[PDB]
Design a protein around this ligand. Structure first.
Ligand SMILES: C[C@@H]1CN(c2cncnc2)Cc2cc(C(=O)Nc3cc(CN4CCN(C)CC4)cc(C(F)(F)F)c3)ccc21
Length: 285
């Protein structure tokens, strides 16, 4: 159990109905101070919130990769319940890219095209790790991607904890609230979530990166039309629709995005392939 006496409060990062998130300093992290994010459960939090908290701890404890959020420690042998992760200073990737303009010499901070590819390749690397562990993320989007120092990307999962992105989730039949615009066609129709559908979502995430998070995927189409589109991928009568090529995206890179959106799960490129393309092949028109 992490010694909670080693956590020095600095600033509250956010609040919730069942807990609080704090930015903490740890002096001499080798066991100047290391900054960490600590989720503390309120002493009056529900037994259901406590259940989610402990299961969240279990899940995270297995994920140890440079492009995945790390669980540093937990304080659970006593109350209040704490979970300690890395602190990603630049917030989520949607908030990060939305604050930048593209570096375009032919034409507020700037971000270059090679840097957008490095960001996407780090997301690919993280996902390759999850896929090799048979772990299906189920909600890959830029909002669930965290930005640290040196343009380091760490894939996370906030769920619906932040009310910031309610427009990105749709309540289907059964009170299940899903991110349909990022979901593969088999997910929306059959609830079939696999590594292959994580690829589809990566494809939509690469679109967001290339758009500098300026627009919602299929923004001109209603939620009902995004669902009806998945039925068109099922019928395979050539009437299904794809996200349009971002202005700064070359045709070669757009062709990779379309592959992630193949009708057949087995035709979608593995994360090892996306990673190599994004890190090596940027020499395309
Ligand atoms: C306090 C702290 C705040 N913070 C933060 C970092 N820098 C700057 N400001 C805040 C990052 C962070 C991330 C997580 C997190 O990422 N946790 C997670 C949970 C699941 C499972 N699962 C549980 C249920 N739920 C519905 C869906 C997700 C799967 C995965 C993943 F992605 F790694 F697989 C990750 C949890 C707590 C915190």
């Amino acid at each position: 159990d992490f010694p909670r006496s080693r956590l020095r409060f600095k600033e509250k990062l956010g609040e919730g109905q069942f807990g609080e998130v704090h930015l903490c300093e740890v002096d001499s992290p080798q066991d100047h101070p290391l900054l960490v994010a600590v989720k503390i459960l309120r002493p009056d939090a529900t037994k259901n919130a406590r259940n989610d908290f402990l299961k969240e701890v279990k899940i995270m404890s297995r994920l140890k990769d440079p492009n995945i959020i790390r669980l540093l420690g937990v304080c659970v042998q006593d109350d209040p319940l704490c979970m300690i992760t890395d602190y990603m200073e630049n917030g989520d990737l949607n908030q990060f890219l939305s604050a930048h303009q593209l570096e375009d010499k032919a034409a507020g901070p700037t971000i270059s095209y090679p840097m957008l590819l490095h960001v996407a390749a780090q997301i690919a690397s993280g996902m390759r790790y999850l896929a090799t562990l048979n772990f299906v993320h189920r909600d890959l989007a830029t909002r669930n991607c965290l930005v640290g120092e040196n343009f380091t990307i760490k894939i996370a999962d906030f769920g619906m904890s932040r009310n910031l992105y309610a427009g990105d989730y749709y309540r289907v039949q059964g009170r299940a609230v899903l991110p349909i615009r990022w979901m593969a066609w088999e997910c929306i129709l059959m609830g079939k979530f696999t590594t292959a559908s994580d690829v589809w979502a990566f494809g939509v995430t690469l679109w967001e990166v290339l758009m500098l998070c300026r627009a919602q995927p299929f923004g001109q189409l209603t939620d009902e039309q995004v669902i009806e589109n998945a039925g068109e991928f099922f019928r395979d009568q050539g009437r299904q629709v794809y996200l349009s090529r971002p202005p700064a995206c070359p045709q070669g890179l757009y062709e990779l995005m379309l592959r992630c959106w193949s009708r057949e799960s087995e035709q979608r490129p593995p994360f090892s392939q996306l990673h190599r393309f994004l890190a090596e092949d940027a020499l395309n028109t």
